[PDB]
Amino acid sequence: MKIVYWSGTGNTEKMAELIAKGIIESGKDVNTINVSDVNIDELLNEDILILGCSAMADEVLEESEFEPFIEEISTKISGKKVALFGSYGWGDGKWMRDFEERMNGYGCVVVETPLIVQNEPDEAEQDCIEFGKKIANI
Ligand SMILES: Cc1cc2nc3c(=O)[nH]c(=O)nc-3n(C[C@H](O)[C@H](O)[C@H](O)COP(=O)(O)O)c2cc1C
Secondary structure, eight states, rough: OEEEEEHHHHHHHHHHHHHHHHHHHHTTEEEEEEEOOOOOOHHOOOOOOOOOEOTHHHTTTTTTTTTOOOOOOOOGTTEEEEEEEEEESSSSSHHHHHHHHHHHHHTTTOOOEEEEESSSOGHHHHHHHHHHHHTTOO
C-alpha cells in the first residue's frame, strides 16, 4: 500500500509512520510518501489511497502542496477506496469533515472513519497503529 501526507512540524508525519507500522504488523508492505516526492501515476495503481494532512487556516487543507495534489488526482480517483487522517490544533475537526466530503464528492469510497489527533500522537499512538490495522483488514 502507500501513504502520502503533508506535515509542517512532524505531527502528521508521526501519525503516518504509526499507521504504516500497523499495516506492517498485520503482514503487509507500506511505503510512507511525503506529498512533495509522490508520483501520481504510480499512486493511481493502488486499491487504497491513505491520505493525511494537518489542519491549516482556516480549517482547510495545506495550500501550497497538499491541495494542488488533491486537485490533480481528483478526476482520476472515482471509485477508489480512500482512508483519511491528520493532526489538528485548536479546532474540532472541520477541515477533516470537509476533506471527507470532498473525497466522497469525487466518487471515492471513504473506507473508515477519518483518524484525527490533536497535536503530536503520543497518547494516541496505539490509535494510529490500530487505524492502520483496520485498513489492512480491507
Ligand atoms: C498557519 C497554521 C494554521 C493552522 N490552522 C489550524 C486550524 O484552522 N484548525 C486547527 O485545529 N489547527 C490549526 N493549526 C494547527 C495544526 O493543525 C496543528 O498544529 C498540527 O498538530 C500540525 O501538524 P503537522 O506537524 O503535521 O503539520 C494551524 C497551524 C498552522 C501552522
